[PDB]
């Protein structure tokens, strides 16, 4: 059969810079069978280019496909924050449609410090017998950050979980959540709950806390 091979696996660009995506086929391909797709975080793929170089209705001019035979290329003249997505090339042949692995487009940008907030667990949750302390690190860059939980000034382990959003469409930043989970009882036996955030953009490791009696 025939196989499509995209490269690079990942591509990091700043707004304005030009993007060059490559798609190679393990065999020559008629241009009418080669198409390009864009897929943004948790959203359906969408067509960008068909027939190797024809742009789909409504697609911005900065997007354009070229190439032939075995080397096809997608070019984004001037990358924009909203272009953060995965790009796939697809082909049809032998009564079978197939896709490349895709190229992930990551946006480079200036360092942004995270804003830290903290949320004591709700009383409704406490009546249920469990406590969830939520610490939020909002809109920052780059993705690397460290958060430690200190109960009554004692470091915690294996009782928290983090979740991180993908790059924002507009400001290209990340957001992070760290959830400390305790039984009502264990939560009961202490008072100062603190969230210490260590990010590249913070001169000194920031801490947000509260006393279980607000």
């Amino acid at each position: 059969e025939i196989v499509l091979t995209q490269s690079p696996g990942t591509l990091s660009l700043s707004a304005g810079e030009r993007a060059t995506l490559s798609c190679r086929a393990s065999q020559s391909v008629s241009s009418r069978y080669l198409a390009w797709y864009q897929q943004k975080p948790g959203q359906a793929p969408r067509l960008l280019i068909y027939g190797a170089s024809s742009r789909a209705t409504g697609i911005p001019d900065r997007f354009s496909g070229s190439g032939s035979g075995t080397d096809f290329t997608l070019t984004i003249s001037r990358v924009e924050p909203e272009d953060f997505a995965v790009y796939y090339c697809q082909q049809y042949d032998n009564s079978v449609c197939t896709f490349g692995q895709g190229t992930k487009l990551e946006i480079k940008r200036t360092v942004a410090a995270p804003s830290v907030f903290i949320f004591p667990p709700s009383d409704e949750q406490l009546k249920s017998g469990t406590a969830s302390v939520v610490c939020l690190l909002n809109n920052f860059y780059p993705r690397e950050a460290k958060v430690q939980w200190k109960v009554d000034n004692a470091l915690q382990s294996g009782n928290s979980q983090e979740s991180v959003t993908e790059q924002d469409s507009k400001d290209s930043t990340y957001s992070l959540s760290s959830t400390l989970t305790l039984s009502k009882a264990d939560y009961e036996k202490h008072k100062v709950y603190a969230c210490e955030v260590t990010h590249q953009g913070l001169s000194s490791p920031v801490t947000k806390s509260f006393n279980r009696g607000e």
Binding site: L47, Y50, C97, Q125, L136
Partner: protein
């Protein structure tokens, strides 16, 4: 022309999956219709297509258990994948194509559907529990305050969260769900809004878990 797939999000192991795509603004007749799926954090795998007149064509790897049907009288086409396993967990999309109605003309998958997540598991469905993430002075900074909703213990995925019935959209972050040790998912949705509007404006999160057909609307206050 809009496409909308529908079907269960949960299927027990070895059972059969059934998804139907409903077309609006266009017609099934004349066109080819495909089914596609995407495994979590992975690539797209074309499943197969069906020509309005009945002719079908499936991918080799799946063919032995795939079955695409069309219902030109309802403007729908369905898919059936027998004996499902965890490997079959993915977001299934429906799309028109890739063979053009006009014999000449290019091949492309367009338009696409919204996609529907299908998780294969023996576990039961469970609606989420929603708690508020109240705006405190500990969640304030200048003219901006942070608040949100905590969606706990639900299975399987996914959950959708909107604020003020879609009215509030900017500064909203819904994190990727995380599987707790209990074998149940959990996630939080946060939104940053003007500190002054905390006394006036009402903030409510809209939680939706299609799997358990559950809907909660929680008021988040100071």
């Amino acid at each position: 022309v809009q496409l909308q797939e529908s079907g269960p999000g949960l299927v027990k192991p070895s059972e059969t999956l059934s998804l139907t795509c409903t077309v609006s603004g266009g017609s099934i007749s004349s066109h080819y219709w495909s089914w596609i799926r995407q495994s979590p954090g992975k690539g797209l795998q074309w499943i197969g297509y069906i020509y309005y007149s009945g002719s079908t064509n499936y991918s080799p790897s799946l063919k032995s258990r795939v079955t695409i049907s069309v219902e030109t009288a309802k403007n729908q086409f369905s898919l059936k994948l027998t004996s499902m396993t965890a490997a079959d967990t993915a977001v299934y999309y429906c799309a028109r194509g890739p063979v053009p109605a006009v014999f000449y003309g290019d091949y492309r998958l367009d338009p696409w559907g919204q996609g529907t997540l299908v998780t294969v598991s023996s576990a039961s469905t469970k609606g989420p529990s929603v708690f508020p993430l109240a705006p405190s002075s500990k969640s304030t900074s200048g003219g901006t305050a942070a608040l949100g909703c905590l969606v706990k213990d639900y299975f399987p995925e996914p959950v959708t969260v909107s604020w003020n019935s879609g009215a509030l959209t900017s500064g909203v972050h819904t994190f990727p769900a995380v599987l707790q040790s209990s074998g149940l998912y959990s996630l939080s949705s946060v939104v940053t809004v003007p500190s002054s509007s905390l006394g006036t404006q009402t903030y409510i999160c809209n939680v939706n878990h299609k799997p358990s057909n559950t809907k909660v609307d929680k008021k988040v206050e100071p």
